[PDB]
Design a protein around this motif. Sequence first.
Motif, short mmCIF file in Angstrom:
data_model
loop_
_atom_site.label_atom_id
_atom_site.label_comp_id
_atom_site.label_asym_id
_atom_site.label_seq_id
_atom_site.Cartn_x
_atom_site.Cartn_y
_atom_site.Cartn_z
N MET A 2 0.94 -1.05 0.05
CA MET A 2 0.01 0.03 -0.16
C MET A 2 1.01 1.19 -0.06
O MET A 2 0.22 2.31 0.32
CB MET A 2 -1.09 -0.15 1.30
CG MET A 2 -0.23 -0.51 2.47
SD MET A 2 -1.32 0.15 4.05
CE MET A 2 -0.21 -0.01 5.43
N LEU A 6 0.29 5.67 -1.47
CA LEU A 6 0.47 6.90 -0.43
C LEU A 6 1.42 7.93 -1.12
O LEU A 6 1.77 8.80 -0.44
CB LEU A 6 1.07 6.33 0.85
CG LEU A 6 0.52 5.50 1.63
CD1 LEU A 6 1.34 4.90 2.55
CD2 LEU A 6 -0.75 6.14 1.97
N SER A 85 -2.04 4.04 7.03
CA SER A 85 -1.00 3.86 6.18
C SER A 85 -0.04 5.08 6.33
O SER A 85 -0.54 6.27 6.23
CB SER A 85 -1.77 3.91 4.88
OG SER A 85 -2.28 2.84 4.54
N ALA A 90 3.21 0.46 7.39
CA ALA A 90 2.14 0.19 8.12
C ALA A 90 2.45 0.80 9.59
O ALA A 90 3.53 0.69 10.25
CB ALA A 90 1.75 -1.16 8.45
N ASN A 117 -6.99 4.25 5.04
CA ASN A 117 -7.28 3.40 4.00
C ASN A 117 -7.78 4.41 2.83
O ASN A 117 -7.53 3.85 1.53
CB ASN A 117 -8.01 2.55 4.13
CG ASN A 117 -7.42 1.20 4.66
OD1 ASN A 117 -6.45 0.76 4.13
ND2 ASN A 117 -7.88 0.49 5.69
#
Lengths: 159, 159
Positions: A2, A6, A85, A90, A117
């Motif tokens: 993820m 970002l 995030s 994380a 998220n």
Amino acid sequence: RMVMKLESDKTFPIMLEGKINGYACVVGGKLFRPMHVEGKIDNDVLAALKTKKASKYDLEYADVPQNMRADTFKYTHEKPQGYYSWHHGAVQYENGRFTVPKGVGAKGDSGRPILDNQGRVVAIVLGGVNEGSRTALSVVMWNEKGVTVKYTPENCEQW
Amino acid sequence: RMVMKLESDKTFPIMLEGKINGYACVVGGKLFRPMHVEGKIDNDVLAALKTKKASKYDLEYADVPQNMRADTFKYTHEKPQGYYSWHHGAVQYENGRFTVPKGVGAKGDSGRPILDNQGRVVAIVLGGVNEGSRTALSVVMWNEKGVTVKYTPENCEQW
């Protein structure tokens, strides 16, 4: 992963003799940077702006011009428990406390925002302290009434 | 090719605390530096040089050491009508005005020696004006008698 979701050109670095020293972010049409980072913001237009001080909350906050407000981060107060995030990786939020894995975060990482998220900032990181396997980190968030609550772990070392 | 003359570049960036604010040229055995920029020349030999000011023409001039007198640009007193070369693309000299395509050149992109097809510098740019169709630039050219004629478009901004 993820990290790729970002990406954000809004966040800007503050250099000190050509090295990463701080991070200033534009959220809700307002530019934020920490007290403890010394240097000049890389963006010339924001460097032209004059910032005011807030010693207790450790934040220079300045009003961005009209054209800057078109693209900026969005802030909300609600913070459901669980994982969030962050640029490095994380993080997890439990019992009213943000925390990160060990060794994640060091000098020059202060001022980075924390994302959720769905892609909107909820708080701004200022520093951290190594509780153990998980590193609790000092971070300024926003309350439902909008009072900018500042949570800070005990004897937190400055980042 | 127009950019195939970047090999001819002998300009020296001027760095202020690690930030480049302009370029200083060595034209005709003479070092020319923009006045409005601040910092130190890239090489130490020219950094230690003493420069004499010129406020009306807005630049510092210095006499090059004898050793590298030959290693310099060669100047030109005439500017035929039409388009010449540059680092950022072909730029046209029309009716006494050196104009570039719009959106070319910004803050810190100053002190650039302009070139023609022959590889000889004819002018040095200092600043510009974003006219709607095309961007004209404040330049320092040379004439036949060599009196350093300088042109500034109305309401000019420094680069």
